Amino acid sequence: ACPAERSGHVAVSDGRHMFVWGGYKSFYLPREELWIYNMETGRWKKINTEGDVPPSMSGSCAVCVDRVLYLFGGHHSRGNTNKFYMLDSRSRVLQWERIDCQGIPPSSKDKLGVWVYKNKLIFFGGYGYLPEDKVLGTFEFDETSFWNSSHPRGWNDHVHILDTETFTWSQPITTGKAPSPRAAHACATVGNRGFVFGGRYRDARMNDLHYLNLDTWEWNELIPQGICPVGRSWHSLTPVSSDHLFLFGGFTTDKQPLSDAWTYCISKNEWIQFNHPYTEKPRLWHTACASDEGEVIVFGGCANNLLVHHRAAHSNEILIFSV
Ligand SMILES: COCOc1ccc(-c2nc(CC(=O)NCC(=O)O)cs2)c(Cl)c1
């Protein structure tokens, strides 16, 4: 009929159709299901996948390139993973493919972000286990995870490249000052600039903005003039044009669910707050996808503090923002 409510799912789009997989609610959602939303008509459609179906997961990182889907990472019932999957959505019953990649993969983690640039999928940050061996960057343990679970976890500032020409992992030699290790940040790509805003680190949910030059591997920090959005994690950051990123929702340091929306103007280096009718619908750990008609499609996520699991208000609403 319609997709069940969920948080921490993935959603990717080609501008017409939005593909939704995974997430959890109050147990993980069925791993074989793939929900497809038509951005032009508003109808959903459920299909069942086969092949090397990934385990049902929260916090995975997914992209849609040339109508083929790539999925990295996430948290399943036995923990975090660093496996890589692809799902060709061009043609026949769709088959997931686990890709045995070459090179040193990233550590097993979730709640990260990715930038697409030509043949490269570029992943940044996240939360998961200590890397099996030293990795270019820094890993910072989360104290609370030691006593809660068998395997402690922590945040990282790693940058990894999966080159789709050969499916080989590598780490670029970056210059500049990289952002601190973080998870639940939001990543967005415009041209050769890989933007990242916000995220959780230590005891803070941050408000800084940075971009990585995807042609020179140089980190730059952006300091916009005037009023800026409150620091947050579990928010969405979506390119809406060559010159504007759309920001919505999330979760403050003081654990307040957010319903504000902003546009970040790249050319002017300025934030502009966006009026919308969903002020009473804060979401965090939702997804957001841009349509070819200048809209942003938000789905799922939780309306309150999802860390109180027995009171968590997960959603299956579609919120349309006209930009
Ligand atoms: C597998 O079911 C999902 O339910 C959850 C939801 C959240 C967490 C946590 N994530 C962190 C790391 C972080 O930066 N979290 C982002 C932040 O704190 O703003 C600390 S607690 C966990 Cl383990 C399980």
Residue numbers in the entry: 27 to 52, 61 to 125, 128 to 359
Per the authors:
However, the introduction of a nitrogen atom or disruption of aromaticity on the ring led to a loss of activity. This SAR campaign led to our first lead, SJ10278, with enhanced potency compared to SJ6145 as measured by SPR (Kd = 8.8 μM), competitive binding to a degron peptide (TR-FRET IC50 = 24.1 μM), and thermal shift (ΔTm = 3.5 °C). To understand how SJ10278 engages KLHDC2’s di-Gly binding pocket, we obtained a crystal structure at 1.95 Å resolution. Superposition with the structure of a di-Gly degron peptide confirmed the ligand targets KLHDC2’s substrate-binding pocket. The acid moiety of SJ10278 is stabilized by canonical contacts with KLHDC2’s R236, S269, and R241. The thiazole and chloro-phenyl moieties of SJ10278 contact adjacent hydrophobic and polar elements typically engaged by consensus degrons. Two features of the SJ10278-KLHDC2 co-crystal structure were notable for structure guided improvement of ligand potency. First, the constellation of hydrophobic residues surrounding the chloro-phenyl moiety suggested adding hydrophobic character to this portion of the ligand might improve binding. This is particularly evident in electrostatic representations of the binding pocket surface, which shows SJ10278 adjacent to a hydrophobic cleft in KLHDC2. Secondly, comparison to a bound consensus di-Gly substrate showed that binding of SJ10278 leaves space in the pocket. However, attempts to substitute the SJ10278 carboxylate with a sulfonate isostere led to a loss of activity.
CRL2KLHDC2 has been proposed as an attractive additional E3 ligase handle for targeted protein degradation. Specifically, KLHDC2 recognizes substrates possessing a Gly-Gly C-terminal degron (C-degron) sequence. First, crystal structures showed KLHDC2 binds substrate C-termini in a well-defined pocket lined by aromatic residues available to engage a ligand. Ligands were identified that engage the C-degron binding site in KLHDC2, subjected to structure-based improvement, and linked to JQ1 for BET-family neo-substrate recruitment.
